[PDB]
């Protein structure tokens, strides 16, 4: 359902990516389906995703290092705090213009109030307005705020920030808005959450972000400084989710982690969230397509695996296992969605050195068994009506060839043969056909013993190759299999006359004492599968000669000559056959003597 909305999104994105047109927007497409689809969780969460991740990129061949270069934290805090201010003011319009909403909101809960309202609405302009309004008794706060608004990242002078620290330690330690402003601006009271005005969790975290000092100023006092490892560590480990109220965390704790840059962590939690499986898949796939996800090496390993030597805590999650489990959900109806998901795999490194999307295609689609929609149909004409595989690539021959290789490894005889034939693999098709026909040749072909179907299929591939102009050795070998099969049918019906005629026609066995030499000189030129049929052929031919001699006795010199020729052939043949067959041939010779 909502899976299907995300699906149509995926199909459109994949078709655009394949046809090579201008870049489709995964993020805006998700947010937009959410605009249409009346799931307030979808709207808010996807707008939050786009509005916190819409920061300047920096590929630089370094995923985790680019995402962790301090400017990444600066842009993160920019988008996050601005979005938070905007959502707060967009709620304020309910208590309501901006300052009117802010005052009526101070009353909805019930000059520092107006400046704090400007802080929480994102307006340094309104902040400076109320500043110049009440610069009468506050003094240097106006100048420090002006310097904060002149430095774009709101970075105060070091002497100014030390002045703000000592100032909030001196006076504001006992006006809560003045204390909050002085501390967050001068990187002061870093331990203090200033719970006097700190009534929201995300607002408190943004105040801590405003308290965060990101530089290696060895002349920055020990405790009044916030480092990203400390903040994120207390936020993930020490704060915990059972404190952050996992109930509302389906929109809240995941949001705190994704805005404090615990990317794979938010993805793990919202993947554990049932109603957020496809959502977590979409967000993580967007990030990894941006190359933003720091991935894990081992696939079998836990959903989050931490490498040895990696910056302590940086989380590496198995995107392989994640998306594989996420596709095992709708694999039973929408293998199209399995393919649209595999679309991310064709570029990476499978450990042996194989294409990931190709490996997934082989395994999953072969197991799925829908060949005609999967890779194409060798139609009534024999052209390949191409499947969705040629709808994503143009190397369907290599796809069917890897299908043939993986199917050989997977022991699928008829299936591997179908795939290799679709790839037009002559040697592999014929060899598989010979391995299959070696056991189904002589076996008593009862009604539907798979024998008639094997004969029909072998002969159909034979007529295809021969009619289209497709070596001669294997082709004549197949002709020999067909001849031996027909002669065996006559022998099983009791047709001694036609059996003798066909045995003389195939000209493989000694019919005359002088022909033993010629047939033995030819026998080394046969395929080993013919050395597999020669034993039964010789037994049957000796029995045929014995039965003809029986008819001539019960109604023989040529029959005895043929028995002696068969003896010479079976004895000088380079095939050390079962001594029991030779014993029975000698018994027939004796009963003819």
């Amino acid at each position: 359902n909502v899976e299907m909305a995300y699906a149509r999104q995926m199909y459109m994105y994949n078709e655009k990516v394949v046809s090579g047109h201008l870049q489709p927007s995964l993020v805006d497409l998700c947010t937009e389906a959410a605009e249409r689809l009346d799931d307030k969780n979808v709207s808010d969460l996807w707008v939050m995703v786009k509005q916190m991740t819409d920061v300047p990129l920096i590929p630089a061949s370094d995923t985790l290092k680019s995402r962790c270069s301090g400017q990444m934290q600066m842009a993160f805090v920019r988008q996050a705090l601005n979005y938070l201010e905007q959502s707060y003011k967009n709620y304020t319009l309910i208590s309501v213009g901006t300052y009117n909403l802010v005052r009526s909101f101070l009353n909805i809960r019930l000059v520092w109030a107006l400046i704090y309202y400007c802080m929480r609405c994102g307006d340094l302009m309104a902040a400076q307005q109320v500043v110049n309004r009440a610069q009468h008794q506050l003094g240097d706060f106006k100048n420090c705020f002006q310097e904060y608004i002149h430095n774009k990242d709101r970075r105060l002078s070091p002497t100014t920030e030390n002045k703000l620290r000592l100032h909030y330690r001196r006076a504001v330690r006992a006006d809560p808005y003045k204390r909050a402003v002085y501390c967050i601006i001068g990187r002061c009271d870093v331990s203090d959450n200033h719970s006097e005005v700190a009534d929201k969790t995300e607002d408190y975290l943004w105040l801590k972000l405003s308290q965060v000092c990101f530089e290696d100023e060895a002349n920055s006092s020990p405790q009044d400084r916030l480092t990203l490892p400390q903040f994120q560590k207390q936020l993930f480990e020490d704060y915990g989710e059972s404190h952050f109220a996992v109930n509302q965390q389906p929109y809240l704790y995941f949001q705190v982690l994704f805005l404090t840059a615990q990317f794979e962590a938010a993805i793990a939690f919202l993947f554990r969230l049932e109603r957020t499986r496809c959502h977590a898949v979409h967000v993580a796939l967007a990030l990894f397509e941006l190359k933003l996800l720091l991935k894990s090496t081992g696939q079998s390993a836990q959903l989050l695996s931490q490498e040895p030597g990696e910056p302590q805590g940086v989380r590496r999650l198995n995107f392989i296992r994640l998306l594989m489990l996420y596709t095992r959900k709708f694999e039973p109806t929408d293998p199209r969605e399995a393919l649209q998901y595999f679309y991310f795999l064709r570029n990476e490194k499978d450990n042996q050195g194989e294409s990931m999307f190709l490996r997934c295609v082989s395994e999953l689609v072969i197991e799925s068994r829908e060949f005609d929609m999967l890779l194409g149909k060798l139609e009534k004409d024999g052209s390949r009506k191409p499947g969705a595989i040629d709808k994503f690539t143009r190397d369907t021959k290599t796809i069917i060839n890897k299908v043939a290789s993986v199917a050989e490894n997977k022991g699928l005889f008829e299936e591997a043969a179908k795939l290799y034939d679709l790839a037009k693999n002559p040697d592999k098709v014929l060899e598989l056909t010979n391995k299959l026909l070696s056991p189904v040749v002589s076996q008593i072909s009862a009604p539907q013993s798979n024998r008639e179907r094997l004969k029909n299929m072998a002969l159909a591939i034979a007529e295809r190759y021969k009619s289209q102009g497709v070596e001669k050795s294997i082709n004549s070998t197949f002709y020999l299999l067909l001849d031996l099969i027909t002669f065996f049918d006559e022998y099983h019906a009791g047709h001694i006359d036609l059996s003798f005629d066909v045995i003389e026609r195939l000209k493989l066995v000694p019919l005359s004492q002088d022909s033993v030499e010629e047939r033995v000189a030819a026998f080394r030129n046969f395929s080993d599968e013919i050395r597999h049929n020669l034993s039964e052929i010789l037994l049957a031919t000796m029995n045929i000669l014995f039965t003809q001699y029986k008819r001539l006795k019960g109604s023989d010199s040529v029959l005895r000559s043929q028995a002696r020729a068969l003896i010479t052939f079976a004895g000088m043949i380079p095939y050390r056959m079962s001594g029991d067959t030779n014993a029975r041939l000698v018994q027939m010779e004796v009963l003819m003597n």
Binding site: P56, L57, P59, A60, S61
Partner: protein
């Protein structure tokens, strides 16, 4: 830049691309870490000089084609009109914006994917052949081995990438391209049947020379004793002299006979040699 390059082309002498680009691009390093990552923020100066090379070649070809068959062949800056293409100027705009710097990576991403000849591109063999020869000259120029080696890296990369695509001339198209990706033409860019093997021997040359500029005199000679031209023999002869400076006696008649091979090939005045044999021999 493109007018100057065209003029140096007409004057049959390659540009000093490295000087001009070192002067314009101040801080860009000379190479890349990985030749598989579609990395817009890992720009090397040599990718840019490769763009400039094929830009000069395409611009010259188009002005030659534009019914010039007009004694000023390059038509100085104010009198003429645009010589390069609009999208090359777009690559120029966005790349220069990023280098002499909210950032969309459409142009640069598409165009790095084209230039580095990674997963999907469109341009055709003559492109990488002329690129490879230009960078062969630029690598043979310096005495600094430390730069020679990475320049042989560029040559070898473009060459081994042209190998598997160039074998596709067996009554078959190279690549169906409705749009001109970066440098797409015809009746110039299509490589005929015969020069493939020629490029392959040149590739054997480039690979063995790479590993000579990397210390494996064993398989360097293993490879250099395969092609049947003058380059192989001159390489091996310098190798014999160097490795047996003061080592052994029997391996000197070897260089003697290989220089006699080179003399039989100089008897026809083969000027494929870089430095004249009347000096070395």
């Amino acid at each position: 830049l493109t007018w100057l390059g065209l003029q140096w082309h007409f004057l049959s002498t390659l540009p000093p691309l490295r000087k001009w680009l070192k002067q314009i691009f101040p801080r860009v390093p000379q190479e890349t870490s990985r030749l598989e990552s579609n990395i817009p923020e890992s720009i090397c100066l040599l990718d840019l000089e490769v763009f400039l090379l094929a830009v000069v070649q395409t611009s010259y070809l188009q002005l030659q084609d534009n019914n010039t068959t007009n004694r000023p062949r390059c038509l100085p800056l104010p009198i003429c009109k645009q010589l390069f293409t609009d999208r090359q100027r777009s690559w120029w705009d966005a790349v220069y914006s990023l280098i002499t710097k909210a950032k969309l990576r459409s142009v640069i991403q598409h165009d790095l994917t084209t230039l580095r000849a990674q997963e999907k591109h469109g341009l055709q063999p003559a492109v990488l052949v002329n690129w490879a020869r230009g960078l062969h000259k630029t690598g043979y120029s310096l005495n600094s081995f430390y730069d020679q080696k990475e320049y042989m890296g560029r040559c070898v990369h473009y060459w081994k990438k042209l190998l598997p695509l160039l074998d596709l001339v067996k009554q078959k198209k190279s690549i169906p391209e409705p749009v001109d990706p970066l440098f797409k033409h015809f009746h110039n860019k299509d490589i005929k049947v015969s020069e493939v093997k020629d490029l392959e021997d040149e590739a054997c040359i480039a690979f063995a020379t790479l590993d000579l500029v990397d210390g494996k005199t064993e398989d360097a000679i293993i490879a250099f004793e395969s092609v049947k031209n003058v380059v192989a023999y001159w390489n091996l002869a310098l190798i014999y002299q160097r490795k047996a400076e003061e080592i052994e006696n029997d391996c000197l008649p070897a260089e003697e006979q290989e220089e006699f091979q080179e003399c039989l090939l100089k008897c026809k005045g083969f000027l494929k040699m870089i430095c004249d044999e009347y000096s070395a021999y």
